Amino acid sequence: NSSKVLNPNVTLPANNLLYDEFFVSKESKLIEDSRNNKLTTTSSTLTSDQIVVTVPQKTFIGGVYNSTTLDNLDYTPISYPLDPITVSYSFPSDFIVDTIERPSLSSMRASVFKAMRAANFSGEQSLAFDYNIKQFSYYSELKIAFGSNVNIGKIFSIDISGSNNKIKRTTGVFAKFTQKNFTIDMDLPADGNIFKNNSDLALTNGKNPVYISSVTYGRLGIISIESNASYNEVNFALKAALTAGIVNGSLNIDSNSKKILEESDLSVYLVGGRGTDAVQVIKGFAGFSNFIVNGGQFTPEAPGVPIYFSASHASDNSVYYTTFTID
Ligand SMILES: [Ca+2]
Ligand code: NA
C-alpha cells in the first residue's frame, strides 16, 4: 500500500563529523570478513546506522520499538507477535546460524550461549581494543559516538544546557573503544513482514516500528576528556592508555600520559564492565584503567554484552539511520 520511514537528521555544532583517528583490531576485522563472506561519510554529513546500547534490558535481536522513542531512552515496545527469526553469528573464525522462536532478551541469551559453545576459535584472542578518536568543543558532539540523538547531559549526569554545552578547559577529546566478540545479524523476514499476523503491520501505523536486526556483543567504552594540555598531548596520552601492555593487573602506561589523564576531567560510559549487565558511568582515570585492565577473553559464560545494534523499519525492512550534519 505504502511504506513510510522516519530517519532522523541531526545538526551538530561541530566543524567535522568524522573521527580524527581510528584503529581497527584483528578480531573486529575478521568479524566483518565473516559477515561479508557469508552510507555518506564526509566531514560535513555522516550517516549512522550503529546505535550504542543505552537500555540493555530492551536491546535484543528481534525486539520491536517505536523509533521516535529511542533517543530519550523510553523504547516504547510494539508487542504484536513475531514470526520466528533466523540469526547468524559472525565470529572472527566461524559463522553459526540459529533460529529464535520468540524473540526476547532471555531467548537471545540462550542462543548466544549455544553459539559460543559451538563456535570454532582460532589462535589466541589479542585483547586489543578498537578505538575511534575525535576532538570536540561541545558536549552534544558526543552524539556521534553514540550513533544517535541521545541526551548526553542525562547519560553523564552533567548540566550542558545553554552555555554549559561548551567545554571549560582548553582541549576536549572523546573516543569510542571496543573489544568485539561477535555480531548477530537477523535474516530478512521470510514473508517480508516480521509480524506473525501480517495484518498487525497495519496496526503499527503511526508507531514508527523498527526492529533490532543486528546486535554486536563485547565490551565498549565512550570516554570524554577535558584537559588544559594540547590536543596532541591528550591524544597521545589516550592512545597510550588504550594500547598499553597489561602486566600482573597493572596498566603499563608511560608516566607522563598517566599524569595527563589523571589531571584531566575524565568520564567514561561503559557497557560490559565486569560484574554487571547495566551501563555504568565512571569518573576518573582509575576507573578507565580498571576497565581496560579487566577486558579479558570471551567465553560462553562471559561473552560480553550487547554493546551496539542496528534497527530496521518494519514497513519495508530498510535500515534505520541517523544523518548527522554540521552548522
Ligand atoms: Ca509475517
Ligand atoms: Na601504542
Numbering used by the authors: 33 to 70, 89 to 377
Quote the original article.
We previously reported that Elizabethkingia anophelis, a bacterial species of the phylum Bacteroidota and a commensal of the malarial mosquito midgut produces a 2-component CDC-like (CDCL) set of proteins, encoded by adjacent genes: one large (CDCLL) and one smaller component (CDCLS). The studies herein show that, unlike their CDC relatives, the CDCLs require proteolytic activation of two distinct components that then interact and form a pore to kill bacteria using a mechanism only described for the mammalian complement membrane attack complex (MAC). The receptor for EaCDCLL or BfCDCLL is currently unknown; however, the CDCLL is the essential membrane-binding component, which recruits many CDCLS to form the β-barrel pore. This type of mechanism is only used by the complement MAC wherein a single C5b8 membrane complex recruits many C9 components to form its β-barrel pore.
The CDCLL subunit lacks the characteristic signature features for binding cholesterol, and the primary structure of the CDCLS subunit completely lacks an identifiable receptor-binding domain. The in vitro activation site for each CDCL pair resides in their regions that are analogous to the β-tongue region of the CDCs. For the EaCDCLs, proteinase K also cleaved EaCDCLL after TK66, whereas it cleaved EaCDCLS just upstream of its TK87 site after IA78. Trypsin treatment resulted in high and reproducible pore-forming activity for both the EaCDCL and BfCDCL pairs, which increased as the ratio of CDCLS to its cognate CDCLL increased and flattened at a ratio of 25–30 CDCLS to 1 CDCLL. The propeptide of the CDCLS blocks β1, which must be exposed to interact with β4 of CDCLL and of other CDCLS that oligomerize to form the β-barrel pore. The EaCDCLS alone and combined with EaCDCLL appeared as a high mass smear, which may be due to a propensity of its oligomeric complexes to form SDS-resistant aggregates.
